[PDB]
Amino acid sequence: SLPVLQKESVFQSGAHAYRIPALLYLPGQQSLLAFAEQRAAELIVLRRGDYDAPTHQVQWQAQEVVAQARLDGHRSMNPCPLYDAQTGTLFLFFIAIPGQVRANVTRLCQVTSTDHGRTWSSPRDLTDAAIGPAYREWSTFAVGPGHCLQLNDRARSLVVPAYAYRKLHPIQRPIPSAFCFLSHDHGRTWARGHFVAQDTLECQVAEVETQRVVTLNARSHLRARVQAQSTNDGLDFQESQLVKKLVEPPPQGCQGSVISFPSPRAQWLLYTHPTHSWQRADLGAYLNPRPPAPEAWSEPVLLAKGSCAYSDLQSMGTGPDGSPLFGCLYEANDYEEIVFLMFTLKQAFPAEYL
Ligand SMILES: *[C@]1(C(=O)O)O[C@@H]([C@H](O)[C@H](O)CO)[C@H](NC(C)=O)[C@@H](O)[C@H]1F
């Protein structure tokens, strides 16, 4: 198990249970926001952490409910944070589902903050406008969970990774497909992008130039991940394939995380996911140095031993040793906690320089 700069439980089972991590880096602020579901999916909680590089440490402030990120009589789940670098606005997207839980009753929601997460606007229900008629051909959908993406296209578009359970045939159960919600006017209007392929679930997206490419990395029902690419900013994921090197454990997979960061030499991808093909154990990191080539995915390196599940990655700028710094949040010990991990490219992939 890799040398890391920090390893700290930031949420743990107590009065409540914590699952579904999301992580947001705020560059100008040397700060991180760690989100999770608080469950009896009830509510969403937040912890802010200040990153002090000379001490190689993030200090986490107190846990707080994001009071506004809720609908009456609904449970809130699947936090997807995004920072709009053009507007200084913080977005938190999420799913609202009736308390009493065939017919779609799932709601799409956003709250915003302009004081870096300290306070929040009241929720906007994006459901009808964002989805339209399709709403009726699904039994449910989700967003994320985890960080979303803002492109460096002209409009600085927002990309919110998602999936839908489609009612495609009357005899078959609903079938899941990944897709993205897109906005070009900074989250005032939303469009639903086209689906990727049958039997994909929780996904995340990253941008790479090498000419703009949205890469999407999706959970599968199969033994490997599904990776897909858009050249039109996430409207169509034209190519799609299984990635045998990125394994998926029994019943039906695990959520994992993908980010891009600057090439030490334009971008490389980092991906986290459990690495036992047999179970949700042994959080590994994988590097794609010639992205998005599926065959360029590396062997995993080991970040955490034992029982690990969902994760969320953030690029945090330059690490004290000069190489890309990464922060990571994942579910651990049979969901008894969510661990924050911070480490650098030099620490994890010493052989691909620093
Ligand atoms: C994960 C999990 O596998 O552990 O799965 C999600 C869904 O059950 C999965 O995508 C299959 O439908 C859960 N999401 C929601 C919206 O409930 C996660 O909470 C988690 F359970």
UniProtKB/Swiss-Prot annotation:
The residue intervals holding the BNR repeats read 111-122, 181-192
User: Active-site positions, per UniProt?
Assistant: 310 (nucleophile), 331
- Residues binding substrate: 19, 39, 163, 165, 202, 219, 280
Q: InterPro entries of this UniProt entry?
A: Sialidase, Sialidase_fam, Sialidase_sf
Q: Name one GO biological process term.
A: glycosphingolipid catabolic process
Molecular-function annotations in GO: exo-alpha-sialidase activity
> What top-tier enzyme class does this entry carry?
hydrolase
Q: What is this protein called?
A: Sialidase-2
